[PDB]
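Structure, all two chains, one model.
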Amino acid sequence: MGFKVKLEKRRNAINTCLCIGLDPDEKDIENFMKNEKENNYNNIKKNLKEKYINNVSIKKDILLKAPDNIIREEKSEEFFYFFNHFCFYIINETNKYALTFKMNFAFYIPYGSVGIDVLKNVFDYLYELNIPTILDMKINDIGNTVKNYRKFIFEYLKSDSCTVNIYMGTNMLKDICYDEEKNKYYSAFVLVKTTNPDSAIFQKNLSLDNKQAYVIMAQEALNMSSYLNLEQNNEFIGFVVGANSYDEMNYIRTYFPNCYILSPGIGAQNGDLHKTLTNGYHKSYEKILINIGRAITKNPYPQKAAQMYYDQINAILKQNMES
Amino acid sequence: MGFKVKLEKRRNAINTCLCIGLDPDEKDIENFMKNEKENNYNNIKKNLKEKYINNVSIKKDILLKAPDNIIREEKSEEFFYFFNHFCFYIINETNKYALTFKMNFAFYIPYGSVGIDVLKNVFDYLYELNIPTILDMKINDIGNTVKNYRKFIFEYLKSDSCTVNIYMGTNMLKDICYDEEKNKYYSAFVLVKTTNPDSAIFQKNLSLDNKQAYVIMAQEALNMSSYLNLEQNNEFIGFVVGANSYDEMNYIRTYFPNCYILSPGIGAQNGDLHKTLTNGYHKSYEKILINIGRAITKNPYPQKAAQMYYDQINAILKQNMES
């Protein structure tokens, strides 16, 4: 029942490795409110039709209220309402093409508690729909402090996985991916520092070898995975590998053959999708999640945007399968 | 008016470099509620006497209500009330001995929005008292994403500084310590990976040199400080250097003579205070902040605990001054 089965199960259903980034900025939210006011709130109306909205934890009866009724009667919940309703809109619109959804914590906290009420309900809504989640939060602190994040992420939000920054040492992973008291196991993706690689000569001259360094770190993280018995519990520790780091991606997929990789970077005005996916390719292609965010969420037609990226990944997977 | 003047000003007033860590766990909060119920709520009563409590942003009139009246009438705000009131209690009790207060974000988020309403008000209360703040949150992400944290930390909380994890690259610092639009400058402490140092031989054998590596990173961060004009704006970028890393601390203070250092690690059952402070010593001793948390906040007499640590730092500063 780990994340590993969650991923394989849904892989067999929708046959993609597309990861949809839900990173709603202040502009997006304002822009949604504006368009919905100007369009007789048709997307919020679409959202209210859906049954799961009745299953979220926080101010359910505010979200359930009519949008006209919100501005007149609840001018104090207007931001909450439109924030929370924009994430629903992206979710309802694009979920059929999503292997997973990844939420960056950063976008949810700069307004105070209120973005955190919405993050909860976003994770509530996605758990009700049984779509695999990643919380991108890049957690990092000492073992006893990091237990707080484990609770927030895996117990409050009930996320399947998160991202982690283990620069300071791998041993924090023991207190994120494992809960001794409750005998529970969780999955994480660790950040790997990847090169330019035109900057490689400067590192040699500095006597640094960034390549030895990230492989050493990589191994320590898989060493932790095995020590924590995560695989036998259907969980894993994988890598966050930048989309344009073609060298590291290839090297990693090669020297750690069955590791899980999450690859951010591709957008509308940059990124070679085939190149990234091919370098990180695995027959079990849930092991190479391709994150697209803004190219979908800021496109005036998110579902079509999502459909296009799904279609592009389809064709690359087909090419790679025929190897 | 930067943090640098803030620090120097208060240094001249209370003459310490003691940093008090306010990291309230679930146990602490429960324990406070229990003791206050059993003691006729004398500390909450003490807290309500104080004038600044009238200046916080979130559910002021819940915090202002009588503690008997909370359990009877507001059983849903009971956790908020006792959480928020325990931080006030530690603050009122120990602030005279504190150069700065450092709050770890981790302790405030695992219950959802509610800990974040309290973090706000904790930062509100400390801004009203004009005590220098650090938010320990170890932020790390790409430049455009990290702008969200800048907003949360420096604009919503109005913190003087934060901690940052720059493993993935120094250039994120441009979007945390500097706001081009508003021409504003902020201070940060970056994490430095320090050795055992019995583990040094293993790194040599791995061809790693962790010492070259953190000094290189260190320089890149001060390079960013100068590029961002933070000094001329009374801000800085300093280092988080573990208390027991006597080697790195000495090396850093030596080779980067006037950098700002924040040193966590010392507690009741470990740490040599004199050794850490002496290794990192600067005549302008706000440049070597010594963080004590649990040894104060979990001690049944926090102010006495705080007074003792203040007194111990006093004596070490005296010894170092007479060099």
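Strands of chain B lie at 18-22, 100-104, 133-139, 161-164, 178-179, 184-185, 187-191, 237-240, 261-263, 288-292.
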